[model samples]
Target: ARQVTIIGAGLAGTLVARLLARNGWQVNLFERRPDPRIETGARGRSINLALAERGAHALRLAGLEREVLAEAVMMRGRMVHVPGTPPNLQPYGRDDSEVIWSINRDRLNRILLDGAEAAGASIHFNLGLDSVDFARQRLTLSNVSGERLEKRFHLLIGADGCNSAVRQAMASVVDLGEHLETQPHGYKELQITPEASAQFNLEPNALHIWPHGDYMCIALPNLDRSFTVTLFLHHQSPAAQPASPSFAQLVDGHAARRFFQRQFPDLSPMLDSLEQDFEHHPTGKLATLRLTTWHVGGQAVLLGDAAHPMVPFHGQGMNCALEDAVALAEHLQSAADNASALAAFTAQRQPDALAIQAMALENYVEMSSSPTYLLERELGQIMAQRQPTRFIPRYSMVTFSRLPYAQAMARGQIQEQLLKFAVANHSDLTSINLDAVEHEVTRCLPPL
Candidate 1:
C-alpha cells in the first residue's frame, strides 16, 4: 500500500489528506499543537476568516460544507459604520445567495481533523517534526511530545504556514525563494457580547466595519450571539502622539478608552471589557509571503500560507488555502508519476496563488479607505448593475462567483478607469450622463 505523509494539520493539510486517503493512500497527518478536538484553543492571536465560494467548493468535495455551515454565521453584506452618520449596507452581490460566511477557526479545524480521521487518515497531535537530515533522507522528530525519533519517507506535503518546516527542508535542496513583508499595521482582538436577552447588539447578519482611512476596526457575528471585533492600527510610527489612535498611542487602558470614546463613540460603550482586552491581547502583525516555487521532484510540496502568505484585508486567505488543496488533489490524483505530479501541480497552482496574493494585498485600500468615498461608490455600483457581466464590482466578482481572480483583477483595472470616466467632472451618479457611461464602457470593454 502506498503511504503519504503531510506535515501541518491545518486546513490545507487536513483536506488534502482526506482526498488522498479516500483515493487509497495511507495518510499520516501531523500537527505540532495539541489536539483541538479535545481542548485548548489557538494561542490568543487568532482572526476569524471570511469563507467564500472557493472554500465552499473544497468543503463540499470533502463532504463537509453543510456541516460547516451549521457552525458558521452568514454575512449578507458589509455593514459599514462611517462615523457621524448612520450605518449603511453595501450589498456584495445582487442578493443573499452570493454571500460569504464568518466561522471560528478552531471549530472548523476540529471538524476537518475529525472528518479526515473518519476517512482513514492518521493525525498525530503535539508531535512536531524536528528537522530532516537531508543527507540521509531522514526526518528527525523532537520533544514536542517529549520524545525524539528519526523517520524516513519518500514524500512530504508541507501544508505548514509561512514559516514552513517542510519548505525550509526542501530549501536545502531546491531554490524555494522567499520574501517576507511586514505591514505597518497590526490587529488586536476585541469582542461585543450579546444583550441581556442573549441577542446580537449590532446587526447580526452583516460584517460590521469602522473604516477610518489610516486605521480601521471590524466585527463579525458569532452563532452564540456575540461579535468578534478587531482593530487594525499602527504598531509603531515616528510621529505618533499619546492621543493618536495607533497601538503605540493606546498602549494602556486609559489611552485605549479615551481613543475609543472619541473615535468610536457609538461602539465604545458596547464593549464589556475593552480596556482589559486592549491591555492584555497581543497585537498581531500582518505580512505577505511570496515564494519562488512550492514543489520539488515530488519529494516535497507546499500549500496555503506555506506557498503564498497573504494579508487578511481581502478576506480570501482561507478560501485560497482550501482552493489550493483542491487543485493539488486533482493534480496528485491524475498525474503520470510522482515527480510529474509534483511538477504539474506546482505549475498549475502558482499562477492562481500569485494572482490572489496580489488581489488580497490590493483589497486593504478598498476595505480601509475606499469605503469612505460614498458618492464614488454609489456611482460605481450604478455602473456595476448595468454592466453586471463585465464591470461587476470587483468585490462581487471575487466573492460572489467562481470568476478567476486574475480575470477579476484585470477587469477591475478597466472598471476602475471606466468609473473615473463616469465620474469625470461630475459630483455623483445623479450628475453623470448615461450616454457618456454607455460610450465609455462599450468602447473599453465588451460585455462579460
Candidate 2:
C-alpha cells in the first residue's frame, strides 16, 4: 500500500487520515501542538461549530456520525435578542426537522483523531513541518527538543490550516497564487454558564444572536448545558479614522461590560464572569484564503483551510473541509495516478468552495433592507411548496440538503431575484399572484 503523509492533525487531517487508512493507505499525521486529548482545549479556536448536512455527510463517510452527533446539541433556529424587547425566534427551515447541530470543536477533533488512530494511522505531535524538498521527495520536520528529521514521503497532503507549512513549501517551489483577504472584524469567545438554576441559561435548542448592526454577538449551546458566546467587533482601525465600536475601545472588563450593557443589555447579566473571560480570552482573526493552485503535481496537495479557508459567517468552513477530505480520498482511490487525482480533486471542488466563500461574505454584511424579508420569505416558502422540485430555499439547500454549493448559489441567485420581483409592491403574500410565481420559477429554474 502507498503511504500518505498529512500535515496538521486537526479536523480535516484526522478525518482524511481515517478515510485513507481505512482504505489501506499507510497514514501519518503531524501536528505542531500537543495532542488535543490531553490539552485543555484549542486556544482561540471557536468553542462550538455548526454542523449542517454537508458536515454530517462527511462524518457519515468516516462512519463516525453517531459518535460525533452524540456529543452535539441540536440548534433549531436563531433566537434573536433585541435589547429591551422580547426575543424573536426565526426558524432556519420550515420546521424543526431541518436544523443544524452545535458540536464542541475540541471534542470533534479528538474523536476524529481517535478514529484515525484506530484505523492504523500514526499521529505525531509536537512535530512541525519545516520545509519540503519536492525535487528530492524529502521533508524537514522539527520537534520540540530542537531536533530535526528529514523524512521521505510517497505523498503529502497539506491540511495544516490557514497557515500551512506544506502550502508555504509548495509556494516556495512553485507559484500557488495564494492570497489572503483579511476581515476588519475579529471575534472573542465568552461563556454563559448554566449555574443549575435551570438546565440552560438560554434556549438550549436555539442559537442565540444579538445583532447590533455594526457588530454582533452569537451564542451556541453546548452539551454541558453552557453556551459559548462570541462577540464580533471591528479591529481598531487607523488612529486618524473615525471611531467605531471596535476591540481597541473594549480593552478591559469594564469597557466590554459597559459596551455589552448598552448594546446587549439582556445578555450582560448572564455573563457573571464576563470580566475574567473578556480579559483572558484571545481575539481571533478572520480571513478568506484564495488559491489559484491547490497541488504540486503528484507529490503534494492541500485540503480544508490549507486550500480555501473562509470566514465563519455561513458556518461552512468545517463542513467544506470535511467534504474536501472525502472527495480527495475518493479521487485518490480511483484516479490513474497521484497527479491526476490531485488535479481532479481541485477541478471538482474549487467552484463550490468559491461559491460558498462568496455566500459566507454575503451572509456577513446582510443587514441591508429589512422590508422585503418577511414577505420574501413567506413567498419563498409558498413557492417552495408549490414548486418543490425547482425552488428550494437557499438556506435549506445549503444547510439541510447535500446539493452542490455552486448549484445552490446559482439557484439562490435566481430565487432571490424571483422573490424580490414577486414581492415587489406587495405588502403580503396574499397580494402576490401564484400563477405568475409558478410561471417565473418554471421559466427561470430547472427541476432539481
Candidate 3:
C-alpha cells in the first residue's frame, strides 16, 4: 500500500485524508498552521458558510453530516431588505421544504480535522510545503521551528487552496493550463449582535439580504443568537484594488450608515462597531481560479479551491470540493492504475466545475444588483410552485437538484433568459397567458 500525503489540513484535505485512511490507505496530512484546537481563539478568515443539499449530501457520505447539522442554523429563504419598503420574503425553492443551513467555517473545519484524526489519519501541523520534486517523489517542508525536512510519498494531493504550492510544483512538471481571475468586488464582515432579552432580532431561519444596485449586504444566523453580516462591494479603481482598503472605505463612507438606518433600522446600533470590525476583520477576495489539469502524472492531484476556486455567491465551493473527494475516492477504488483514476476523476468533474463557476459569477450579479420587479418576482415564484417538474428557480436548481453543476447552471441560465424575454413583453404577469408562457419556456428549454 502506498502512503497518501495531503497538503493543507483544511476541510478538503482533512476529508480526503479521512476517506483514504478509512479505505485502508496510510494517510499523512500536512498543515501550515498549528492545530486550531490548541489555539486561544479563532484567528483566521471566519465566515458562516451556507450548507445546502450538496454540502449536506457530501457530509453524509463522509459519515459526519448529523454532527455537522447539530451545530448549524437553518436558513429557509432570503429576506429582502429594500430601503423604505417592508421586507419581502423570497423562498429559496418551490416548496417550503427547501432550505440552507448556516455553519461556522472554523467550527466545521475543526470538526473535519477531529474526524480525520479519529479515522486513523496522521496530521502534521505547523508544517508547510516548501517545494516538491515530482521526478524524485519527494516533498520539502518547513516546520514551525523553521526546520526543513524532506519526505517521500507514493501519492500527493494538493488541497492547499487557490494559491497552492503543490499545484505550482505540478505545473512545473506539466502544462496545467491554469487561469486565475479576481473579480472587481471584495467582501467585509459585520456582526449583528443579539438583543439583550430576545433570542434573535430578526427571523432566525432566514438569510437577510439587502441588495443594492452594484453591491449588497447579507446576514446569516448563528446558533448563539448572533448573525454574521457580510458586505460585498466593488473596487473603486481600475488597478486591482486590495480587499482590505476597499472594504474599509465602503464602510466608512455614507453607504454603511445609510444602509443601516434605512434597510435594517433595527440593526443601526450594531453599526457603531462597524468601523472597528471593518478594520479588524480580514477582507475576502472574490476570484475564480480554473485549472485544466487537476492531476499530474498520477503521483499528485489537486482538489477544492486548488483546482476550481469560484466566488461564494452560489455557496457551492465546499459542496463541489466534497463531491471531488467522493468521485476521486470511487475512481481510485475501482481503477487498477493511478493514471486512469486521475483521468476518470477529471473527466467526470471538469464540466460541472466549469459550469458552476460561470453560474457562481452570474449569481454575483443577481445577489449584488439585479432589480426585483414585483411582477417578475411574483411570476417567477408562481411558475416555480405551479410547475415544479418543468420550471425551477435558479436558487432551487443550484441548491436542491442532484443534477451535475453544469447542467443546473445551464438550466438556470436558459430559464433566466426566457423570463427576461417574457417579462420585457408582458408588463402585467397576471394578465399574460400562462399557457403561452409555458409553451415559450418549453421551446427555449430542452426536454427534461
> All candidates' lDDT scores?
0.80, 0.88, 0.80
lDDT of 2 at 426: 81
Question: Deviation in angstroms for 45 in model 3?
Answer: 7.3
Model 1: weakest 10-residue lDDT segment is: 39-48
Give the lDDT of residue 368 in candidate 1.
80
Q: Which ten residues in a row have the lowest lDDT in candidate 2?
A: 194-203
lDDT of 3 at 323: 79
Clashes in each model (backbone N, CA, C under 3 Å)? 0, 0, 0
lDDT of 2 at 117: 94
TM-score of each: 0.91, 0.95, 0.90
Worst lDDT 10-window in candidate 3? 237-246
Model 1 per-residue lDDT tens digits across residues 101-191: 9998888888899889988999987777778765676787665545887778777888988778888888788787887888878998987
Best by TM-score: 2
What is the Å distance of residue 389 in model 2 from its true position? 2.2
Evaluated at residue 175, the lDDT of candidate 1 is: 81
Ranking by TM-score: 2, 1, 3
Clash total of candidate 3: 0
Q: After best superposition, candidate 2 residue 126: deviation in angstroms? A: 0.9
List the candidate 3 regions with Cα displacement exceeding 4 Å. 39-46, 94-96, 196-200, 238-267, 370-379, 440-448
lDDT of 3 by residue, 1-101 (tens): 65689999987898888888888888899999888888676555447888888778878889999999999998878887775687767778645568899
